Amino acid sequence: GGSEFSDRSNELEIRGKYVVVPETSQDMAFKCPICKETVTGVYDEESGEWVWKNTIEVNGKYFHSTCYHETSQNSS
Numbered sequence: 001g002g003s004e005f006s007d008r009s010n011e012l013e014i015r016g017k018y019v020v021v022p023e024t025s026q027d028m029a030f031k032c033p034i035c036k037e038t039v040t041g042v043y044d045e046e047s048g049e050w051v052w053k054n055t056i057e058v059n060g061k062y063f064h065s066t067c068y069h070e071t072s073q074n075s076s
């Protein structure tokens, strides 16, 4: 019984991630090569900017956070 944290495991917390879409972006979109699916930006009224929901950037490539989490090679 958390005060403000969810007890529903880390499974939801991967999908809750986002990254800000710049005004220089090509139509606010990119494609996930893992599942072959296109992400689109969504407006944020507080900052006055846009955000890519469930999205991650790494080494010049774009992916879904839930997709890339399955392929994250790590040990060091």
Ligand SMILES: [Zn+2]
Pocket (backbone or CB within 6 Å): 032, 034, 035, 036, 037, 063, 064, 067
């Ligand atoms: Zn994907």
